[PDB]
Amino acid sequence: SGNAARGPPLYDLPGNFRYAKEFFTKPAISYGEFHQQCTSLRLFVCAGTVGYMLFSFTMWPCRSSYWKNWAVWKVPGNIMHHFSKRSGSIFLDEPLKRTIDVPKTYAHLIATRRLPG
Amino acid sequence: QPLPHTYVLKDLVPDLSNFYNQYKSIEPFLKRRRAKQPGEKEYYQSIEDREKLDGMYECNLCACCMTSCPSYWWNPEYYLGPAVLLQAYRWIADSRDEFTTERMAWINDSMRLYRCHGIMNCTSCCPKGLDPAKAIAKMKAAIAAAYEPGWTKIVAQESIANKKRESGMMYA
Amino acid sequence: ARVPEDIEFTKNRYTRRYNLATEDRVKLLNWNAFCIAVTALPIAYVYYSWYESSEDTDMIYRTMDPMREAKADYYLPLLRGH
Amino acid sequence: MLTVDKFTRAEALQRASNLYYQVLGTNWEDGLNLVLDVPFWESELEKVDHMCEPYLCDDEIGPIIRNLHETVNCMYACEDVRDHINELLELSSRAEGVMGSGAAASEEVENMPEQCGMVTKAYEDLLARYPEHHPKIEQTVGHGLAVLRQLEKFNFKSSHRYFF
Amino acid sequence: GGIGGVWRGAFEVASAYTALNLERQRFANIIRLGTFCRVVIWPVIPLVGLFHYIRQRDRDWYALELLRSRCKSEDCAAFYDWTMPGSSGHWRMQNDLEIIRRAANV
Amino acid sequence: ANLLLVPSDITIIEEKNKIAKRRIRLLEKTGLALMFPVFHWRYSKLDKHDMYNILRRKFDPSASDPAIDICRRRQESVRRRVIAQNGLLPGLLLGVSLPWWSLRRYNYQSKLIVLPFCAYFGAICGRIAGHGLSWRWVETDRQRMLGNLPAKVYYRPK
Amino acid sequence: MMLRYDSLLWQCTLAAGIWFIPQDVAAISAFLLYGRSKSRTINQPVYVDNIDTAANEYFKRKGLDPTKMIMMRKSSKITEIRYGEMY
Amino acid sequence: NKPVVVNTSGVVNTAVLGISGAWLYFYCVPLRRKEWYDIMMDYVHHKRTQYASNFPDKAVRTALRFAKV
């Protein structure tokens, strides 16, 4: 099961860095070593992509509070939420009673940047 | 019945020529860089080192394990099989042998070694109770840890050393 | 069947017969050519996909947060569910 | 070759020597090794020839180039012959049927001994043509003949050295 | 050759291309580029897609927060009711359902 | 007891506001034809027949009525769904023929191993391409919801 | 051919069936459950004692003339109403 | 209930690592990930011939003959 040994294991950072470097300096003269250069290069390319993502969300954090729902301990609760919604029809049988008319208020704000009245 | 997936010469007599050819390929004879100096007696080997060969030097080459390996059923002419791989590691493990890297480089081939899928039909049917699967697993681990970029050149240089050999299977 | 008996085998690198090994090499190029082409799908999806509730989202930023700086008072129960 | 890259003789020697041992050390018997690697060898071989052109008379680079070219010649020749043997073996296998039962057995090869005679003749030609590559020839073509010898009983000079 | 000659001649030109006509460098580069795609590019793309998903959904959710703040309303269900199925919780979707109900019933 | 199936509210509005018949474009016809049958153990999803009715009705482009605007938005969403179905067949055919030609000289086992997976992968690629080219990846959640509203609903008394 | 119950072919099939069928059925059931969860929220079946009374009520509420509406009984427990004048 | 700011970097980054790690693991670490390479080597490799008839060649050949090339 698997290919013949082509290089170092993943956790060997110094060994992988050597193959990743050769991807640019020493051209490969066989498929096996070229594949190894890509796999070793993949380690750092993937690490860089994840690295920037973590940096980006720290330097420029997400502004909404929705992401508090993605906490690990809240995941099972979110799963149960989608399986426990009230049965019925998507269409409204009776008008909804809200204390604020959001569509009407929204229209006024866009037109004037000012609340009605 | 004769051994599975073998060409029957007559009745129960199988045709095991391929098995013999594969065995000769690994060159199962001690190799040393320096010839025995005059006045030198047997090579030193401690009891502990000699104990490593206990489970591997007892093979009778019956080929029961060879013909019980499904990987050998599919690729008999490319896969060395449980018996030949067990013997290859016997010489690799031997302390007296000084060509460990050459042997590991040659055996480090996708067809020769890595067709073993851990089925374990080899250890189950061994008449002498040897464990070819265990030895094959150790050889893979040793090769993976010891691999170097220069192994391919090592194989080539040994092939040049075999240039004047007669016909037959060999290191190449 | 009867395989041809007058095959002119390859003699050197510059006098080569066409064999299945060469045809396999052509397969390798074509299958890898497919991998280059099929990469357009995942890239196209990421570049073109959008996730927006409705057309009001753009209108809200245009009128209430044009510089992506306007802070908004947070009321946790809104998006917290309870 | 169309390239603007420049290399010193020391670099050219290293590239040619690396390619020479890469080809010779590779296991030619496994067909996939040649399928996957040959495209890489050709690209490199084109570069090596271009940079080593001024050193074809060099006392060090010269011999390496000759061996490299000779090895590539032998690799293609052995591959072609062994490729034909694989076809003969595959035809024999399919003639066995499904599960080797003959359930949907195909038509057998009616001129198997003729093919064996043709293949062995090619095998002998390789040995004479490439006296310094016998280890590789025996690995690919010599072993292939031994497999065929199981299917059909034919005589070749090295048959006794393969336990036949 | 008549009309047939033209038919065969056009086909001969049409089916001219073969991989064997490629230069040695381009033959290998195509394999290299294909191998690079499978190993490197493919696993990276989902990560980039995840990044854009988060950024766009954050943009969408925050717009709802901005709207509520300007309205200065504590009636959360009026802006996004979490009990309604599918996407109908969003206030815009609720309005569309309200329009449908009004125009359908008497 | 008994279950009563009646047209949904949005279906009622479409019937009330339609002005004429709408011509079915060529890709729309092929898309509907290639759409799989949908058995209905229960009723919650639009099938090829419901989609045909939606595409057949014609609405006034200039009407400013909010209800009519919803009908147009629903129709556009359904149209994108229907034409996207054309991508499935080309992918499946290419998913089978191309690997089969590639493995033509190989044994039957290889074709059994490889073709089923390539066939499914080809169809998947076709469906992605069809949905992508049908502008489905840029629809807002509002438009998608309207295009997925059921046409038939169990009647709820009172 | 020589077939034996303890053969690798037959034993592998039984091992595969025992190992995978319990997993597959559970996995398929879970997906079916998720589909049911969405289905009931979008359109829950509701039972009416008398079809005629419900049908009349439906026409009144929606302002539909019964003459132009066609009523058909797809099954014993299913009755469907359709527009008579539909393209 | 009305915080002046909300900390999202920690939660978002944790999700990124968990999602990225799982995907990168499945695609990079396991040996099972090379299962398709093994199956092809076991049953498909070197099992080919040009002297046996196959439908794709026959179909192409007949169509060319039918159309006179």
Ligand SMILES: CCCCCCCCCCCCCCCCCC(=O)OC[C@H](COP(=O)([O-])OCC(O)COP(=O)([O-])OC[C@@H](COC(=O)CCCCCCCCCCCCCCCCC)OC(=O)CCCCCCCCCCCCCCCCC)OC(=O)CCCCCCCCCCCCCCCCC
């Ligand atoms: C195309 C190559 C492209 C290569 C790459 C580009 C580089 C090349 C650049 C230069 C190109 C030159 C163009 C040549 C035109 C054809 C003539 C020719 O060379 O014939 C050689 C040879 C004639 O020899 P000659 O050297 O011309 O001179 C002979 C002597 O002079 C002795 O004279 P003679 O009296 O014995 O000769 C009798 C003479 C009598 O001819 C004359 O009277 C002389 C003038 C002929 C001009 C021909 C121009 C093209 C006609 C078609 C026009 C279509 C208009 C469409 C308008 C749009 C709306 C529909 O016959 C001809 O000249 C042969 C005419 C062949 C016409 C067919 C062209 C190919 C098929 C496409 C058109 C199909 C039309 C179907 C109509 C059906 C009606 C029911 O013709 C043949 O034997 C074979 C004919 C078939 C040619 C097939 C070409 C390949 C087509 C597929 C290309 C695909 C490319 C790949 C990518 C495509 C991506 C989509």
Ligand SMILES: CCCCCCCCCCCCCCCCCC(=O)OC[C@H](COP(=O)([O-])OCC(O)COP(=O)([O-])OC[C@@H](COC(=O)CCCCCCCCCCCCCCCCC)OC(=O)CCCCCCCCCCCCCCCCC)OC(=O)CCCCCCCCCCCCCCCCC
């Ligand atoms: C109106 C109707 C009529 C007109 C129609 C339109 C006409 C337009 C004309 C102008 C445009 C032309 C377009 C290009 C077409 C050119 C095709 C071509 O040249 O083919 C060369 C090719 C030969 O070249 P070769 O390299 O030597 O190949 C050898 C064989 O092909 C052996 O091959 P293999 O065994 O290695 O297998 C091949 C297969 C190996 O692979 C496979 O088999 C596996 C495939 C993957 C597995 C999964 C399958 C899933 C498939 C999914 C499909 C897509 C789904 C998504 C889309 C859905 C739809 C929306 O390769 C592939 O599948 C690779 C595909 C690569 C795709 C690359 C796409 C490029 C995209 C470029 C970017 C986009 C455009 C630019 C804009 C960019 C903007 C950013 O010919 C063939 O393939 C023919 C094979 C069948 C033989 C019969 C036909 C030929 C005649 C032979 C006669 C022999 C007679 C001998 C007689 C001897 C005695 C006298």
Ligand SMILES: CCCCCCCCCCCCCCCCCC(=O)OC[C@H](COP(=O)([O-])OCC(O)COP(=O)([O-])OC[C@@H](COC(=O)CCCCCCCCCCCCCCCCC)OC(=O)CCCCCCCCCCCCCCCCC)OC(=O)CCCCCCCCCCCCCCCCC
């Ligand atoms: C459901 C829809 C999808 C279904 C499948 C669709 C199939 C079409 C896919 C099209 C994409 C491209 C396909 C490969 C292109 C060719 C690559 C190539 O030539 O590279 C050298 C290639 C090895 O390339 P490599 O990239 O160095 O090695 C890949 C390693 O895995 C080392 O990889 P790594 O270290 O870079 O790690 C990354 C690894 C990461 O891999 C993964 O992510 C895992 C995938 C594992 C495989 C899953 C499927 C297993 C199916 C086994 C086969 C079926 C058995 C029978 C069952 C049914 C019985 C009735 O990536 C891969 O394994 C390759 C990905 C692309 C191909 C495989 C796609 C699998 C899709 C699976 C989707 C479902 C996933 C569910 C997960 C559930 C989780 C609990 O070696 C060979 O070609 C050996 C051939 C031996 C036989 C001789 C054949 C003639 C030789 C002449 C040349 C022919 C070329 C074409 C070969 C294929 C002919 C059929």
Ligand SMILES: CCCCCCCCCCCCCCCCCC(=O)OC[C@H](COP(=O)([O-])OCC[N+](C)(C)C)OC(=O)CCCCCCCCCCCCCCCCC
């Ligand atoms: C030798 C081999 C080297 C190993 C490989 C190294 C490659 C690593 C590459 C990582 C790429 C990161 C891409 C992130 C994609 C996700 C984010 C996204 O798309 O958002 C769009 C974002 C912008 O969106 P945004 O959402 O972040 O924007 C918010 C910012 N404001 C508020 C201002 C709008 O842009 C980018 O993606 C920019 C990515 C920059 C990545 C830089 C990577 C440098 C890596 C250095 C490695 C050095 C190697 C040296 C080797 C030497 C060898 C001897």
Ligand SMILES: CCCCCCCCCCCCCCCCCC(=O)OC[C@H](COP(=O)([O-])OCC[N+](C)(C)C)OC(=O)CCCCCCCCCCCCCCCCC
């Ligand atoms: C030296 C090491 C070299 C390693 C090379 C590794 C290459 C890895 C390739 C991965 C490709 C992933 C593509 C995902 C699809 C993205 C499509 C897209 O929408 O893109 C545009 C968008 C633009 O974002 P946007 O915000 O404008 O919105 C576009 C529209 N939406 C929002 C709908 C998506 O995002 C990106 O640009 C995505 C990130 C691209 C990162 C690609 C890899 C960067 C590799 C950097 C190497 C650094 C080298 C270090 C040394 C330098 C020395 C000088």
Ligand SMILES: CCCCCCCCCCCCCCCCCC(=O)OC[C@H](COP(=O)([O-])OCC[N+](C)(C)C)OC(=O)CCCCCCCCCCCCCCCCC
């Ligand atoms: C240096 C230290 C670094 C440490 C890094 C640690 C990394 C690992 C951390 C784990 C992160 C996990 C993030 C999951 C994504 C966030 C959760 C999410 O989106 O759910 C909320 C979402 C939000 O739903 P929502 O839209 O209802 O949220 C609103 C919530 N209410 C209604 C209450 C207002 O939930 C859902 O959509 C429901 C389905 C959830 C699916 C969860 C997927 C789990 C993935 C498991 C993978 C396991 C792989 C390994 C398995 C091995 C088995 C042997």
Ligand SMILES: COC1=C(OC)C(=O)C(C/C=C(\C)CC/C=C(\C)CC/C=C(\C)CC/C=C(\C)CC/C=C(\C)CC/C=C(\C)CC/C=C(\C)CCC=C(C)C)=C(C)C1=O
């Ligand atoms: C060819 O030999 C073989 C190898 O080479 C030695 C292998 O390497 C290998 C290993 C290869 C692999 C593991 C690769 C993967 C292999 C797989 C998935 C299996 C491939 C083989 C097959 C699918 C078998 C081919 C198909 C069949 C044998 C058909 C099976 C179905 C059968 C026999 C049912 C047909 C029965 C009938 C037609 C009878 C009909 C009955 C009636 C009409 C009775 C009517 C009665 C009344 C009352 C009216 C194998 C399996 C092999 O068989």
Ligand SMILES: CCCCCCCC/C=C\CCCCCCCC(=O)OC[C@H](COP(=O)(O)OCCN)OC(=O)CCCCCCC/C=C\CCCCCCCC
């Ligand atoms: C022996 C025991 C056996 C047990 C068997 C049963 C086990 C059951 C286990 C629990 C299963 C629970 C499944 C729950 C599924 C719920 C799915 C869900 O809620 O999804 C929708 C839900 C929101 O949708 P709705 O609220 O319906 O409204 C529409 C949009 N506003 O989705 C989300 O909130 C997002 C979910 C998190 C996604 C995380 C992954 C990131 C996905 C995007 C990746 C980036 C884009 C793709 C890039 C690809 C590039 C190639």
Ligand SMILES: CCCCCCCC/C=C\CCCCCCCC(=O)O[C@H](COC(=O)CCCCCCC/C=C/CCCCCCCC)COP(=O)(O)OCCN
């Ligand atoms: C190799 C075998 C090929 C076999 C044929 C395959 C054909 C595949 C076609 C069906 C699948 C396509 C995807 C499914 C459809 C998606 C939805 C759709 O219709 O997409 C369009 C957009 O998508 C497309 O346009 C897709 C086009 C795909 C074809 C692209 C190539 C075009 C050039 C063809 C040249 C043909 C040359 C013929 C030569 C003849 C010589 C005699 C949506 O836009 P609309 O709002 O409807 O209107 C757009 C314009 N107002």
Ligand code: SF4
């Ligand atoms: S069965 Fe045991 S003794 Fe016989 S060849 Fe195999 S390992 Fe050696």
Ligand code: F3S
């Ligand atoms: S049965 Fe075969 S697969 Fe390995 S464990 Fe034994 S040699």
Ligand SMILES: [K+]
């Ligand atoms: K030793």
